[PDB]
Structure 1
Amino acid sequence: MEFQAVVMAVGLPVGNKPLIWYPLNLLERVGFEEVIVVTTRDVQKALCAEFKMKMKPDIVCIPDDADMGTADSLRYIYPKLKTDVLVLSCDLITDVALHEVVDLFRAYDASLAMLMRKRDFIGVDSTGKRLLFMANEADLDEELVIKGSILQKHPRIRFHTGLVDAHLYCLKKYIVDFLMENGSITSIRSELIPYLVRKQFSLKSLDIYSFIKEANTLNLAPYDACWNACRGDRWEDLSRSSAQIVSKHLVGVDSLIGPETQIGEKSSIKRSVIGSSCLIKDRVTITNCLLMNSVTVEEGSNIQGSVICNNAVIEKGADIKDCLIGSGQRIEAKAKRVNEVIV
């Protein structure tokens, strides 16, 4: 082999579907027995047993310390890394056939690679393979400084502000080393990659090989975004709701549910997904939103665009509107407002 599916993931695979587990799952589908999976040990061991809660016969768990930045944890796990690494971020939910990026890499002896589905304006090449610049408006105020050298060599540049990369970086061992001595370089996505591109110019030079994508992305602070995912998820679930105690009467509109769950009467669901093994069986309606379990539900949940996570309750008089369920909700009736609220 020539790789290691090391996964820079910290912080849970929520939903009716092991989401966080899915970068693993997908790379597992294409070889890659080894999967280094750094865990979360800022308090306790709250992540590894959650992997014992999964179904891949070859996974590995890595504890950690208080704060572990991307390149920081890179330098941390550095010793046990004895090949060309294949780093990967948390929320890979993306049907990209990875053979394309490693294709380009294995082709042009690339000192790096990454992906970009459609801050952070970038300059990509004419051919669209050897990118030539990346930055964000945070980096510098307004001046797109491009050192005349590259335009004197690489003639024609297209730009891209319309990007959603996925923090996936096929690497080369010597760059891992070049980082290992660079103690100050804290994070790959923010500082490493742009530093390398900066050092593309002062064949034994270096390479950078981006890629444009139009298929799926990496989830962030709005996780309702991956409700898109949810709607689409069942297609990913072609051979890899889906199984539950269904009603076939309540509104089923692009729904998802795990087995041994809330099966009752007088419910509904409209264009969203649900939780698994929770209390939602009384006279209820749709909520056009997703919920986590352990939230007793009853009395016609007239809600829309929210989250009912754990540590929640409602019964016999309930009604809401776009008010998330966080922690500290021993509720039975709280008419909510569609604005920003997490009760």
Structure 2
Amino acid sequence: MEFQAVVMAVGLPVGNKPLIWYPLNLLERVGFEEVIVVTTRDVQKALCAEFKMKMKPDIVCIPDDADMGTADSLRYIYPKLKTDVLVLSCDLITDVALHEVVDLFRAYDASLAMLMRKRDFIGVDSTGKRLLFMANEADLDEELVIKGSILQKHPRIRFHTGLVDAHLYCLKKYIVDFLMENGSITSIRSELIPYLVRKQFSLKSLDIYSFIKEANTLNLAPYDACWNACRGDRWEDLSR
């Protein structure tokens, strides 16, 4: 089997419907006969009993610890994964056709392929699919720096400002092998993105790809995007 979908829960079903139901339904629509779901334990370690009350074909719910991250979540399920990893989240309701990111993962044999939908400044090549840079001022002392080798190999890099991460990744086996071999990573969204973006700027190397959609948008953990979730689910869940 090509993919093993992993759904993260780090601080949940507060809305017109369950927040866990939309990612699982999206997964169970196109394939994904077995789904590994990670339960939450930071806010309350009792949502897994709320996770086993759905009507899906097959779910794998595991208990987790309170103080844990997404990189620790992937390092926790390392002896039970044997193929590529397709990471998800709970608060992510997307009307985007999922097969674009998987087509970019298969067609170019990328090492990581991600999906964004219109803070974090990203630079993607003129083809629009392969990314080259991403940074925020949370960890930047200086304003912005660009490596010289990526300007010698890619002379024009289109930057984007309003793009937010929908947290839909496509990891390979050796990426999770290096993540398990390097226990200094705690948040995989800031670790697997920036370290692989730096290591791709080396010939024989790795490929990172991204799809910028223009159909819908994801949500957030806070109450800033909790008002549009019901308006999205009232007009987008009728077709699903």
Displacement over 3 Å in runs of 4+: 41-45, 221-224
Q: CA RMSD, aligned part only?
A: 1.8
Q: Per residue, is there more helix in 1 or in 2? A: 2
What pairs up with 1:262-341 in 2 under 5 angstroms? none
**Where does the alignment leave 5 or more consecutive residues of structure 2 unmatched?**
none
**Alignment of 1:16 onto 2:51:** no
Q: Between Structure 1 and Structure 2, how many residues are aligned?
A: 240
Determine the structure 2 residue equivalent to 1:201: 201
Query: What are the superposed Cα offsets for residues 136-188 of structure 1, whole Å, 9 maximum, x if unpaired?
Result: 01121343111111100111111011101211111111111011101111211
- Change over 3 Å in CA distance of 1:40–1:225 after alignment to 2: closer
Q: TM-score, normalised by structure 1?
A: 0.66
Determine the structure 2 residue equivalent to 1:120: 120
CA distance in 2, matches of 1:142, 1:214: 32
- Change over 3 Å in CA distance of 1:63–1:154 after alignment to 2: same
- Change over 3 Å in CA distance of 1:230–1:152 after alignment to 2: same
- Are the counterparts in 2 of residues 121 and 137 from structure 1 also a CA contact under 8 Å? no
- Per the TM alignment, residue 44 of structure 1 is displaced from its structure 2 partner at its CA by 6.4
- Per the TM alignment, residue 41 of structure 1 is displaced from its structure 2 partner at its CA by 3.4
- Are the counterparts in 2 of residues 39 and 61 from structure 1 also a CA contact under 8 Å? yes
Percent identical pairs in the alignment equals 100
- Per the TM alignment, residue 43 of structure 1 is displaced from its structure 2 partner at its CA by 7.9
CA distance in 1, matches of 2:42, 2:231: 34
- Change over 3 Å in CA distance of 1:135–1:44 after alignment to 2: closer
- Per the TM alignment, residue 239 of structure 1 is displaced from its structure 2 partner at its CA by 4.4
CA distance in 2, matches of 1:137, 1:44: 32
Mark the structure with the bigger radius of gyration: 1
Determine the structure 1 residue equivalent to 2:135: 135
- Change over 3 Å in CA distance of 1:221–1:43 after alignment to 2: closer
Larger RCO (CA within 8 A; separation ≥ 6): 2
Larger mean Cα displacement after TM superposition, 176-185 or 136-145: 136-145
- Change over 3 Å in CA distance of 1:239–1:155 after alignment to 2: closer
- Are the counterparts in 1 of residues 15 and 229 from structure 2 also a CA contact under 8 Å? no
What pairs up with 1:47-58 in 2 under 5 angstroms? 47-58=47-58
- Change over 3 Å in CA distance of 1:223–1:55 after alignment to 2: farther
CA distance in 2, matches of 1:21, 1:11: 17
Query: What are the superposed Cα offsets for residues 206-248 of structure 1, whole Å, 9 maximum, x if unpaired?
Result: 01101112222332244352432312312323243xxxxxxxx
- Are the counterparts in 1 of residues 92 and 166 from structure 2 also a CA contact under 8 Å? yes
CA distance in 1, matches of 2:214, 2:84: 27
- Per the TM alignment, residue 45 of structure 1 is displaced from its structure 2 partner at its CA by 4.2
